[PDB]
Copies of this chain bind each other. A is one copy, B any other.
Amino acid sequence: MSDPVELLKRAEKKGVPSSGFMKLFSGSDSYKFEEAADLCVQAATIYRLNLAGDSFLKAADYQKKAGNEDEAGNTYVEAYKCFKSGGNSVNAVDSLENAIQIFTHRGQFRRGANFKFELGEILENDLHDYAKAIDCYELAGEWYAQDQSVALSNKCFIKCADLKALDGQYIEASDIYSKLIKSSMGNRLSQWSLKDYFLKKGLCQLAATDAVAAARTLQEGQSEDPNFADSRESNFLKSLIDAVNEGDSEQLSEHCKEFDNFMRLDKWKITILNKIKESIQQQEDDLL
């Protein structure tokens, strides 16, 4: 079985550009980079995970030097596979950046959005670097929206608007809860999600202490979507608005427990509700 170290050494030797006088006699350096990339891909296949990933990165760099950006993007995706699976999230991120850049330059925005969402997942879950995860979900959603893929765009914007609300960017999250609402009106497949969106929008507007906007969102949802009108989510949002207007945190706690009994509050709703509670209590203390 060939030794991958020797293959990488041969790839390195072949990957030296012709400099000076021999450049007048040597053909295009593209072929040398192609052969070095092939050697690097072989080494990567034998290693196959971190050493396989590093070997695919070298291959992709040589493919870029050859003018074969195409294979370079594919090879960066392979490097990302190797890195993600080796627990090396940083190199996975780097590989996805290079692959996405190659794709977007080439006019594969769909593939770019796919890997942009994958990148956002790596940023959110493995690196906990939420800001760039928000950025990636937003940009992937935009690229899907250009492609007229409403479902994928909505998935990205659900993630993006949700990371924004947990980061305290409640107004911007509400603006993305609003886009999701318009993109989902009239679509029978999204009816269950639509109620959810209305609720979350109001919650952000309650965490931004704009109870008037929450009331308006409630009225809008009640008027535009009959399924939301009679839903437990609409009643819950109304009760939360009434409690916020009354400055009664204990009542809002009762409402949260009641709603929890019938439809479990997931971590996000608990989190946002806790800030709504804190705002009411802070107003009470300031009035004392």
Interface of A (DSSP majority class): helix
A226 interface residue (CB < 8 Å to B): yes
A226 CB, min distance to chain B CBs, angstroms: 3
A253 interface residue (CB < 8 Å to B): no
Which residues of the other chain, B, contact A178 by a CB distance below 8 angstroms?
Answer: none
Which residues of the other chain, B, contact A81 by a CB distance below 8 angstroms?
Answer: 146-148
Which residues of the other chain, B, contact A90 by a CB distance below 8 angstroms?
Answer: none
Cβ 8 A contact of A226, one of B1, B146, B266: B266
Given A1-B105, A109-B48, verify A145-B85 contact (CB < 8 Å): yes
The contact size tier of chain A is 20 to 34
A107 interface residue (CB < 8 Å to B): yes
Q: Which residue of B lies closest to A147 (CB)?
A: B81
In angstroms, Cα B270 to Cα A223, docked, is 11
In angstroms, Cα B106 to Cα A227, docked, is 43
Contact yes or no, A85 B266, CB < 8 A: no
In angstroms, Cα B264 to Cα A264, docked, is 26
A20 CB, min distance to chain B CBs, angstroms: 29
Given A146-B48, A146-B82, verify A230-B264 contact (CB < 8 Å): yes
Interface residues of A in 76-93 (CB under 8 A from B): 81-82, 84-85, 87
Cβ contacts A132-167/B at 8 Å (1 or 0 each): 000000000000011110000000000000000000
Which residues of the other chain, B, contact A105 by a CB distance below 8 angstroms?
Answer: 1, 46
A37 interface residue (CB < 8 Å to B): no
A184 interface residue (CB < 8 Å to B): no
A194 CB, min distance to chain B CBs, angstroms: 13
Given A48-B146, A107-B48, verify A264-B1 contact (CB < 8 Å): no
Q: Which residue of B lies closest to A107 (CB)?
A: B45
Cβ contacts A220-233/B at 8 Å (1 or 0 each): 00011011011000
Contact yes or no, A106 B146, CB < 8 A: no
Contact yes or no, A267 B224, CB < 8 A: yes
Given A145-B85, A148-B85, A148-B87, verify A45-B106 contact (CB < 8 Å): yes
Q: Chain A: residues with CB nearer than 8 A to chain B?
A: 1, 45-46, 48-49, 81-82, 84-85, 87, 105-107, 109, 145-148, 223-224, 226-227, 229-230, 264-267
